[PDB]
């Protein structure tokens, strides 16, 4: 079993894990899994943490003929509605031989007391497509069984997790609020049609 990458500052503060971590530049996929998880040499230069902000920096020497770094950037806003610190990863950054690329990750959020887990975080269409690009890019990315926690961590172990995928999603919830409405309308229709009867008698 692969160990989570753990960022330690007097105690463990950020945890990151995947069943697979891979990336591509110009469609050339590279597996980073064996270059990452449990690797004692794993370069975390410029990783950072604060009570309400976090940056896991993952750096590598051979990828795409360059030193490359990923910054996983997370916040712990106080969501006033629920009076709890919901966290979010609002962006990823990729720093290259001389430039930066970015993604917006959509759904990565939960209360700070819990990790977040998703079966995919990726830019690739079939793998949830959570990494939206607002402009065209040479980068593509996939985290498989992505699990992250950057606040309220205890020990080199996650707390419980908000799974990304629930019993409902937009197209389903809107699909039901139509369907479990027009099926009521159909039953009113069918009640009147099934109430149809005919006389057992006729005049002379």
């Amino acid at each position: 079993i692969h160990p989570p990458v753990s960022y330690n500052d007097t105690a463990p503060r950020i945890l990151f894990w995947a069943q697979n971590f891979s990336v591509a530049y110009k469609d050339e996929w590279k597996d980073l899994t064996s270059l990452t998880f449990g690797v004692e040499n794993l370069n975390l230069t410029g990783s950072f943490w604060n009570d309400s902000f976090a940056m896991l920096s993952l750096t590598y020497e051979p990828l795409f003929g360059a030193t490359v770094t990923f910054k996983f950037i997370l916040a712990s806003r106080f969501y006033p509605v629920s009076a709890r610190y919901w966290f979010t990863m609002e962006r990823l950054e990729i720093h290259s031989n001389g430039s930066v690329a970015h993604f917006n990750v959509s759904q990565v959020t939960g209360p700070s007391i819990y990790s977040f887990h998703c079966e995919y975080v990726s830019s690739l269409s079939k793998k949830g497509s959570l990494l939206v690009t607002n402009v065209p890019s040479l980068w593509q990315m996939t985290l498989h069984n992505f699990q992250i926690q950057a606040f309220n961590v205890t020990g080199e172990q996650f707390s419980y997790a908000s799974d990304c995928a629930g019993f409902f999603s937009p197209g389903i919830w809107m699909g039901l609020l139509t369907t479990l409405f027009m099926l009521f309308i159909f039953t009113y229709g069918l009640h009147m049609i099934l109430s149809l009867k005919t006389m057992d008698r006729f005049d002379d």
């Binding site: 937009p170 139509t178 027009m182 309308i185 009113y188 069918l190 009147m192 049609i193 009867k197 005049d203």
Partner: protein
Amino acid sequence: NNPEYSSFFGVMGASSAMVFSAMGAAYGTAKSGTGIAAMSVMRPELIMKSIIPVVMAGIIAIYGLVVAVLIANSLTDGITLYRSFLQLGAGLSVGLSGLAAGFAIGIVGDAGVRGTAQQPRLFVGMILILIFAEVLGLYGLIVALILSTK
């Protein structure tokens, strides 16, 4: 750009326009038909005059068809949710209005036919009362046309 599912609502609009109008026309034809049968035994000469609530129930199915076709021609893979929900609003506005108007035509038909059998003076009034129920069908169609063309 638009969601993968986006076209579903507009398709349910096209379907509901036909399905609910067919339900309304079916009831309207079933009640009027029963009326005709149980009138005709006593007043056979009144069949050809009394089919009126049946053709009108048939016209409430046509109001659904008009919208169902007009929605179906307006669909595409890339359709924005805006146009797709306008088409679903059109689908209810004709469809359930046809279901409503069809019930009034069915019941007023079944009364009107069995009334006219005993009282020839009803035959103008029955058709005035039915034309009000057909206009309820237009009050579906008209907005469903307006929505589909928006």
